Amino acid sequence: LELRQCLPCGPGGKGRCFGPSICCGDELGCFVGTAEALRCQEENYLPSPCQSGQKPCGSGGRCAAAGICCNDESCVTEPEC
Amino acid sequence: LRQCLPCGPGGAGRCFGPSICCGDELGCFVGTAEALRCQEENYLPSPCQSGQKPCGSGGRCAAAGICCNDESCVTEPEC
Amino acid sequence: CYIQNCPLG
Amino acid sequence: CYIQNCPLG
């Protein structure tokens, strides 16, 4: 399915929202409910569907940051990232 | 069981695992520079465990609405 | 919206 | 260490 990435977020917009409160950047880590993740709540009003990152991993989502796997509600360690 | 190494923003959070540093007034850092010091917990002989209100899969409540265990954080509303 | 959470779909 | 991944007991 050909979706857009979701709103960027975090330090200098280097990160992509993976769900309302999860802002992960490839070279950043993942902010889950921190300040860095603020913009990610706006994605909820945008009427178009989005999906962040490529390599789809785990619980339902896809690799968000170095070895982390988040979907729209959870980030777990997962080295398959 | 003690709360693990404090971490993050002026030590105002607590390690919930090697790369997971959460706090009421902070939220969670899963794998950021904030969560680098939690790796130190792995060379403390004493066992620790952060949080009080359990949830999920042997997770506690890391921060408002987030439930973390040693390898993952999840939105959990009753947290 | 997050594909997983979008209205209708 | 993390209770989960210590030597635990």
The structure tokens listed for B12 are 């105002």
Nearest to A19 by CA among A37, A1, A46, A35: A37
CA distance linking residue A74 with residue B3, whole number of Å: 22
Nearest to A75 by CA among A51, A59, A55: A59
Are the C-beta atoms of residues D2 and B18 closer than 8 Å to each other? yes
Are A32 and B31 inside 8 Å of each other by CB? no
Q: C-contacting residues of A 26-65, CB under 8 Å?
A: 43-51, 60-61
Are the C-beta atoms of residues A62 and A53 closer than 8 Å to each other? yes
Residues of B in contact with A76 (CB under 8 A): 71-73
CA distance linking residue A9 with residue A36, whole number of Å: 7
- Long-range contacts, stretch A9-12, CB < 8 angstroms, 24+ apart: A9/A36, A9/A37, A9/A38, A9/A39, A9/A40, A10/A36, A10/A37, A10/A39, A11/A36
Query: CB-based contact (8 Å) between B12 and chain D?
Result: no
Residue A50's Cβ-side half-sphere holds a number of Cα atoms within 13 Å equal to 23
Are D1 and B44 inside 8 Å of each other by CB? yes
Name the CATH architecture for the domain at B1-79.
Sandwich (2.60)
Phi, then psi, of A73 in degrees rounded to 5:
-155, 0
CA distance linking residue B14 with residue B38, whole number of Å: 8
Element (H, E) at A30: strand A29-32
Place of tokens 């969560």: B35
CA distance linking residue A65 with residue A58, whole number of Å: 14
Query: CB-based contact (8 Å) between B30 and chain A?
Result: yes
Residues across chain A: 81
CATH fold of A1-81, please?
A: Neurophysin II; Chain A (2.60.9)
**DSSP conformational letter for A3:** P
Strands B13-17 and B20-23, by their bridges, are: antiparallel
CA distance linking residue B50 with residue D3, whole number of Å: 10
Chains B–D, number of C-beta pairs less than 8 Å apart: 32
CA distance linking residue A70 with residue A80, whole number of Å: 12
Are the C-beta atoms of residues A16 and A9 closer than 8 Å to each other? yes
In one letter, which amino acid is B27? G
Residues across chain C: 9
Residue B30's DSSP bridge partners are: A30, B20
CA distance linking residue A42 with residue A61, whole number of Å: 19
Are B1 and D3 inside 8 Å of each other by CB? yes
The structure tokens listed for B8 are 């993050």
Chains D and C touch each other (3 or more Cβ pairs < 8 A): no
CA distance linking residue B56 with residue B66, whole number of Å: 10
CA distance linking residue A76 with residue A36, whole number of Å: 18
